[PDB]
Amino acid sequence: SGFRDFLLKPELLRAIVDCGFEHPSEVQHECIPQAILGMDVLCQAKSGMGKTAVFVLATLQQIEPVNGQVTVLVMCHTRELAFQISKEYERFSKYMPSVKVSVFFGGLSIKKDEEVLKKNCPHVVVGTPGRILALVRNRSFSLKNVKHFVLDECDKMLEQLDMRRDVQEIFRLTPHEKQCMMFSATLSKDIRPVCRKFMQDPMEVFVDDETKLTLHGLQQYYVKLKDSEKNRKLFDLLDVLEFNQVIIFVKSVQRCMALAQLLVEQNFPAIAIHRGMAQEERLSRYQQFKDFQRRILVATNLFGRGMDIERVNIVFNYDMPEDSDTYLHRVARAGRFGTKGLAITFVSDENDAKILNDVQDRFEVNVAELPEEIDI
């Protein structure tokens, strides 16, 4: 419905349907209308906000495939994200058979990559900058037809001066007349001027800037609990906080499955989603949480990659987040629109307490020690 208002090709609309998406995310409303007009884009958005689909959809909307011509180049820092982005291109081009996507992150030898490039002639190339640069240096393909140049994890790529030089050398070999879009889950204030030097009057979106402002309105508590005390305290808190939608973040896939199982055995309506599950399964489980029976989602980081995860009432850090960016991104979903949110963090050791202090220091908020009397 709302995607139709973007004026996307019917082939893209049909693929968006098949992917189970109902309406555009907030980041998509902000970015897609101008991205499909060729405007440069600088966008920071955390996982699970529809960020990847902004550039996949906008570049597929504009692409005019010519055999032998790479017209879309997408690069990122990690092999796994390059692989996952290539799969997102496959899902959204389901009804665009003329579009060919290939990915190059080092999984094959450089000679095998050269063979794939010459045989398959992709119009969309995804990869990491080291391998892309080596392939162009060896004349395995040409960058002279690139019309869309996209970076993801762009802060990782441009911080590391090694990769920044490779990115610039690749940028130099593309036409000056091109659309440039850069995405990242995090964008420090220091890295934004660097990104801007590659662009022309870009539209800019920084989700975390807004999240850092609303954070003072979020009720945030911690509980000092070693591991062996976490379940009893959690079970007790979940009893008093009934009729709320809750996400519980844990640090690993097996802790995710086990906690959700223990919760279900304890008669809580919980479901597990971790970042290793396939998209179709993550979507199916997430629909149960957002629309139907499940009130508690046990999750790892990145459980909602490629999806649009709505706000909830309460967020638990059952296991401490690894840094303060991760804390911010986890608790940002606490508080449904126009209501009060609650974040509760389990602190088990001194390293945990260190992170909580960096959190309170960086975002200028107080994470109070949770009381031990009635919650009103």
Numbering used by the authors: 13 to 388
Direct quotes from the study:
In mammals, UAP56 has a paralogue that is 90% identical to URH4914 (also called DDX39A). UAP56 forms the apo-TREX complex, and URH49 forms the apo-Alternative-mRNA-EXport (AREX) complex. Each helicase selectively exports a distinct subset of mRNAs, including key mitotic regulators.
The crystal of URH49ΔN41 contained SO42− and polyethylene glycol (PEG) around the interspace between N- and C-domains and the ATP-binding pocket. In addition, UAP56 M243 and URH49 M242 on each loop were directly interacted with UAP56-V224 and URH49-C223, respectively. Although the amino acid sequences constituting the C-domain loop are identical in UAP56 and URH49, the C-domain loop of URH49 covers its own ATP-binding pocket. While a more precise understanding of the differences between UAP56 and URH49 requires their ATP-binding affinity analysis, our results imply that the URH49 C-domain loop likely gives URH49 less affinity for ATP in the apo-state, allowing it to maintain a different conformation from the apo-state of UAP56. The crystal structure of UAP56 and URH49 in apo-state showed the distinct configuration of the N- and C-domain, probably due to different linker structures.
